[PDB]
């Protein structure tokens, strides 16, 4: 049940990409492996630390949501958990740490940033053959700030706690949440998986 509701995040929030396929690989379901449960907790107590802070600045409410992440170094993260220090200002909205609510947007990261070279067996970024990995975070927004074009932060902005990258014309195709402290997320999900052939 639990295992089937992220299954159900993980293929109903795929969507047909702008690049048609070129960072992510061309497909329209996924064939999930394995999901399991991570059970950090030091991690899952420096998240929960920090959450009730976040929801004290925040009407008493963490604003807490459950979204994807892909990186090359989901295993790194697992053990040692999210990093701000390993994020530079080069991204849309700078230095932080990026999530989507849509898994196939994830998924374009997790050969690297427009999906690097692909899997490191064949260097295909539409690999079929290789197994992939992404997160299933927990993810504290807290008073998060809505912006709609390029804002190349270091931190949150002032009396904030997070970004939502909203879609616009001349911008974003889907949305995107972005963290500028790494303890302001814990991933709870490591869903093993490859993207499917379309029929
Ligand atoms: O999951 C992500 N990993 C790195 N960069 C991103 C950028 C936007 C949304 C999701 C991601
Ligand atoms: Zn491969």
């Not at 059970?39 to 976040?54: A, D, G, Q």
């Not at 927004?141 to 912006?147: I, M, N, T, V, Y």
Request: charged share 20%.
């Amino acid at each position: 049940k639990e295992f089937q509701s992220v299954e159900e995040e993980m293929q109903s929030t795929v969507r047909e990409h702008r690049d048609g396929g070129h960072a992510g690989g061309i497909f329209n379901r996924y064939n999930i492996l394995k999901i399991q449960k991570v059970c950090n907790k030091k991690l899952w107590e420096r998240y929960t630390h920090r959450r009730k802070e976040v929801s004290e600045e925040n009407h008493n409410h963490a604003n807490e949501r459950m979204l994807f992440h892909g990186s090359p170094f989901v295993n790194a993260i697992i053990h040692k958990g999210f990093d701000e220090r390993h994020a530079y200002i080069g991204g849309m909205f700078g230095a932080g740490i990026y999530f989507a609510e849509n898994s196939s947007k994830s998924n374009q990261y997790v050969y690297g940033i427009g999906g690097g070279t692909g899997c490191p067996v064949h260097k295909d970024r539409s690999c079929y053959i290789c197994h992939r990995q992404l997160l299933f975070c927990r993810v504290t927004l807290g008073k998060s700030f809505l912006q709609f074009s390029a804002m190349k932060m270091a931190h949150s902005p002032p009396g904030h706690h997070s970004v939502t990258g909203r879609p616009s014309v001349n911008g974003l195709a889907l949305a995107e949440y972005v963290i500028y402290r790494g303890e302001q997320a814990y991933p709870e999900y490591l869903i093993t998986y490859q993207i499917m052939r379309p029929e």
